[PDB]
Amino acid sequence: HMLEDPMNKALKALGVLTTFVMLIVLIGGALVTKTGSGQGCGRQWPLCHGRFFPELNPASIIEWSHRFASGISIILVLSLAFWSWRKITPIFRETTFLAIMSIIFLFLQALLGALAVVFGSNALIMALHFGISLISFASVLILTLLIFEADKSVRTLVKPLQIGKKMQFHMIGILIYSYIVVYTGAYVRHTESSLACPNVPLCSPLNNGLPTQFHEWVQMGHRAAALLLFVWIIVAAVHAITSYKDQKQIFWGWISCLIFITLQALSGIMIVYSELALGFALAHSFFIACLFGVLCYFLLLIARFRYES
Ligand code: HEM
Ligand SMILES: [Cu+2]
């Protein structure tokens, strides 16, 4: 392919690896405790540090793989930030903002996680961790995207597209609102309001399906917030399908967003129905990661378009 130094494809490999590790750090948190002394332990059995005799269980692998990914992340992120900064910035000026964003948020989530060991009873603060971890991942994801695009003459995704004002409203607006919905979700978790409402879409058989207790209000607020996001994405997708059919990145970008929002909602309903089976929990952290990634991709398009035009 390219007669340049073979070490370059190693920067692409590092990008893929780190993006993957950062995704693991994020969605893996759906399987282990993030607060208290049992932090790092499978959520279903907070005791994994100390007393137990047995070893090599499938739940022990999860706990080892998460702590491993979290430790190795500092090494990987710093290396990717530096190397890509040194090599990719000449072509993409955005490279530096991303490298920096990657480092800052990796540290922010590590800082918040450290504090969660002892201040995990503050749900309002604890509910900030996911969104931070999410941006840590999205920063590395987009940086990796630029690393690949830097090595192509006909770029696949990072193309200078014409983004109209309305589409820009939807893109940026949905990006920001999705982050808010992400907070309400994290707030349900850390506030233990996950199973307050056995039914869907409404709360329960009693009180006409309306919340009448703390945990039911948190649960319901999350679902309500999610519904609005869902509807907005449908409106945004329809505008893309109608007015951006000639700009396939935007056309398909939103279709995939539509699909991720659907899978997010479905896995959310399944968390409830299954009474928080971690497999659905894991799915619920993963699809929002995909959707947010696409929204951050869109933000890069706008950032570049606003610089160009
Ligand atoms: C479609 C838009 C939705 C988005 C973007 C979204 C996002 C999130 C996020 C970011 C969390 C935090 C996860 C964590 O901290 O581990 C969460 C948790 C949760 N979500 Fe959603 N959610 C959506 C829809 C739903 C729906 C429709 C339901 C259910 C009817 C739902 C039920 C839950 C529950 C029960 C939790 C807490 C799970 C736990 O304790 O780990 N979500 N959501
Ligand atoms: Cu309670």
Residue 239 assigned to a binding site: no
Half-sphere exposure of 299 (CA within 13 A, CB side): 20
Q: Scan for tokens 């589409």, then name that residue.
A: 167
Nearest Cα to Cα of residue 31 among 207, 209, 277, 201:
277
Told to judge if 63 belongs to the known catalytic residues of this protein, a careful annotator would answer yes
Q: Is 170 annotated as a binding residue?
A: no
CA 43 to ligand 1: nearest atom: 41
Cβ–ligand 1 contact at 34 (below 6 Å): no
**23 CB within 6 A, ligand 1:** no
Indicate if ligand 1 lies below 6 Å from the C-beta of 222. yes
Number of domains into which the chain is organized: 1
Q: Which of 4, 55, 63, 275 is catalytic?
A: 63
Residue 96 is part of which domain span? Answer: 1-309
CA distance 177 to 232: 10
* C-beta 26 within 6 A of ligand 1: no
